[PDB]
Symmetry: D2
Subunit: 330 residues, 4 copies
């Protein structure tokens, strides 16, 4: 008897349209509704009982925290239903990785949750979205997906929503993780090679059902000749934490350190991430005296991932030692 899968559409390239078959890169996002996406893959009926809902219709670079909450709360309601076995979210690529991590942290369910997009719109020749959507539904319908946390199923892969990132522009292999794909999906079947290590979903201390509004968190970049201007301005305009997207191992210019000390003293969390994203991690107390300054390192998480975790964590704690524990467990 086939699994019951709900597709939650949010917009994106997978729902996009361009002017000609050769327009694989120049198009408008968020033009097709969920029922047209489903009807475009008649084979979905072979692998699941699918129904669709239009949660929003956006280009994902324009997503808001309120959009994350609305989507996350709808996912939770559906997960609580005995009529729902798995959930697929169709999404723009730009912030797919942010949504996927958010859901991984706040959805206290073992039911499969898959986020999926495309790099080419469906109007293009050789568009990737049809098979990606088929694969998302296959994975969301597979017993092997239960308890694995949020998954992303592009490029014939099963990627962890935690640490997959949009890493390559244009090409269909865009989404990569420093820690590899966990599996592959081919001709409807899932093949697993690794399991998650980090806390997720049912083993998370966080729950979307308790979050009413997310704390404001912003990101500032590190580079030669950088000043403290962006950090100070972002804090002045409401940032409760700043993600520092440092050079190297989360390093901080000597012209920036004093401002970050003052901001921490005034209650703003300081989280050291980096723009060195293909591998490794930011080590506590290496580039900066995090203990002395009461700062946090983002471990392996890229800046936009670190922002997501910081927002969720700060719904529970203002203790920088607890925030560091969270950045070491999730």
């Amino acid at each position: 008897k086939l699994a019951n899968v709900v597709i939650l559409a949010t917009g994106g390239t997978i729902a996009g349209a361009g002017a000609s078959a050769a327009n694989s890169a120049t198009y408008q996002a968020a033009k097709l509704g969920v029922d047209k996406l489903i009807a475009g893959v008649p084979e979905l009926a072979d692998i699941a009982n699918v129904r669709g809902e239009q949660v929003m219709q956006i280009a994902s670079e324009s997503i808001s925290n309120d959009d994350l909450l609305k989507l996350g709360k709808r996912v939770a309601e559906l997960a609580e239903s005995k009529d729902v076995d798995g959930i697929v979210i169709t999404h723009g690529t730009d912030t797919l990785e942010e949504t996927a991590f958010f859901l991984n942290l706040v959805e206290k369910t073992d039911k499969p949750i898959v986020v999926v997009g495309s790099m080419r719109p469906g109007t293009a020749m050789s568009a990737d979205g049809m098979l990606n959507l088929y694969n998302a539904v296959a994975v969301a319908s597979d017993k092997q997906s239960r308890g694995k946390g949020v998954l992303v199923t592009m490029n014939d892969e099963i990627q962890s929503g935690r640490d997959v990132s949009m890493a390559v522009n244009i090409k269909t292999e865009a989404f990569k993780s420093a820690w590899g794909p966990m599996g592959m999906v081919v001709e409807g079947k899932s093949y697993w090679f690794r399991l998650p290590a980090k806390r997720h979903t049912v083993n998370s201390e966080f729950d979307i059902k308790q979050i009413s509004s997310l704390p404001q968190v912003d990101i500032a970049y590190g580079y030669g000749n950088v000043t403290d201007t962006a950090y100070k301005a972002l804090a002045q305009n409401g940032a409760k934490a700043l993600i520092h997207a440092g050079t190297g191992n989360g390093s901080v210019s000597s012209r920036v350190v004093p401002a970050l000390q003052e901001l921490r003293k005034n209650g703003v969390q300081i989280i050291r991430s980096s723009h060195v994203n293909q591998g490794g991690f930011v080590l506590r107390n290496a580039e900066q005296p995090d203990d002395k300054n009461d700062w946090v390192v983002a471990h392996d998480l890229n800046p936009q991932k670190a922002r997501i975790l910081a927002m969720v964590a700060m719904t529970k704690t203002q203790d920088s030692k607890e925030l560091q524990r969270i950045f070491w467990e999730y």
Copy 2:
């Protein structure tokens, strides 16, 4: 008989020291003067006649534009000397890629220029800097390096200074290019597999001998729920161009577009880069109407690289169409 190579020291991990041989990651940069670097590799005398100068002694995350100018001008003076065959710059990893690209754009010489760092300090077990420095001198001494633009010689590789980036934290393989290594250096010998295809050094329209100041350029990051705050603050504190480190294909949130239009009319150049850095490029007129808005795309160049090119280019032109040509040629 042997090539005359000058080593210009700037600091970094390659000049660093940690507390014990197990401290491969926690250390102080910029502790050893150039003479100590040279003494630490007595094998250099086998492959070149080496002389050293201390240009600065910094942690490279703290470099300034005045530092770049001083270094660039000293490189040019040495390259004009008949007593100099090649130049090696020892440098911290954090902003190595920024310096390397800067020199690639402004040094009108065919003489080899190599920038080199290390991921472990020389005090650590299995420190990488000794062989990296040996290799830098070998490559700077090799006739095959003439006319190839600025090179980076870590991890047994010959990388283009244009597009090599610090991509992996901690590990000695940190420096990668989307377009591959151009060669390798093994037991003093250089093996080439690709040539550059972008303008550099002697074929550049830019010349450090004509540059006495650099326009201020800053970088702002894109992510979910981003606002226009950092962009406006950076411009209010002097930025003549803003590098937009967007999601995806340089995409701009609908909450940010209006500010960027206002900034461009106020004369701030708007350059669309991305935090999608493993491959691909940002395509003009795809995500945003760059022709209508008089914006520029950074092509394949990551945000910190785009800042370097923009700042050099704006010593010559503020014509957005010329800036786009430059971003498509360099």
Copy 3:
């Protein structure tokens, strides 16, 4: 005003058919004729004046040396024609890399030659072949492609036919080079980032017009507990050279060295390649005393690539020192 491009069909997945739209991986190669294959991309007319020929209709794992000669000779006849500006070869993926390198060595033309395949059959949802074929015709029609050697245009990339290899199974990113893509092709436009640095096409010493037969070359694998059996059996059945696909840096088991010395004295060339294919190269005189034994190292070339170069080279020379020069130049 449009380039005149000839498409030479040879079979493969690009011309394949599976049972349903979900059969992206289980299919029959070499079912669709060239005319219907071209008619599947009517947009080709926008970028070139195309015509097709059916050279052969094979699954590429079953290609022969006679097939290579026939294809190579037809390519040369067309390149000599003032009615032809560029040539595209549609091909199965399995041995695409072998054909591409062969043509790179023996076609003394600056006219663009592109080899292209697909990872999914044209019957599958999200089939890659339509845009791959469009891109191959775009690249074959572009003035930027003149003089660049043989190219492969899958996954939105421009890869060198020399050193691109089938590296990833199933996925559309299958074809990779250790030395990176040279460029990309997006919405009909070619974007170059590197140039070749190895001898090819017009600068090759080899010429298909002078080659009527190819010497027999075979490949044997190295692994734990390997014996000399395959090496001896392949030479007994006609091999004029043996490609050793060694472990590590082309290493040879002590159980195998004596047989390879006796084979070399019997006139069989011994070429040390490896099954370590993501990067690096096999260094002469490191693992084995190549000068003493009169053996050759394959440099960076994988076993099947080394076979192609050896077979072409041995149409001209059997001097092991000349073969080593060839393996260092091509």
Copy 4:
């Protein structure tokens, strides 16, 4: 208190010596004894109570099945001892990946087992073996390593012994897995990001204590114009299974299929692997009718890995369906 770690030396580059400090690539393996290896890393005493044994002293390209059994049986004896908490094996790189997988299949212990080598000999500038050996002992002493299967600790990584392979020649990053590193080891500490998902060690159905001699298994390569010669000859000289290192998705030339059908009919197992090693897997019934022919696919495992698993599996079964199960579980 400190963990009790035993180092089992087998030879290799890590125990190698070259003529000068610049000889990072040209050297002699297997020159230093285990006590001198240990003495070269005096920091080991800080992290564990270490003792060494010299099991063998070989270049690993020359390893035999009897060497694997001797090593595997000594590992088992040590793992049974209450005086032993973890085991490190120092090994040549060439067949490190074969030993690591073998031990992962046949050692029924949760105690950590780490295999480690180096890409540069200890006589070279910037030699990698000291920190690799320190890291191997750190990981072998860590409670986090218990129950994880055999690990490989080069390049600051924790790699699974199952699917790590020597993938890059020369460089210290040689060992890579298609499924990513599982973790990293930095300044004595282990950081995990993924867990194994294939059967290993205590959950394996195989046990070194019952294996007296391994079945003979050999490997033959696929390429253009390949014949059935190597397959027939290897079987004639004792192969009980043949690993087919096919092109593409384990594809078999039409000139080879008939021979493999005859060999299977005569009792020789036929296992389809590939020389497409960076990612993906070989899919049953896709390229060849494995059910009709009673063949096996090697899943994601490269040829030399598939040989190891086939030998171990055939100590238990000659049933091709059970061999396929094993290739899908291990």
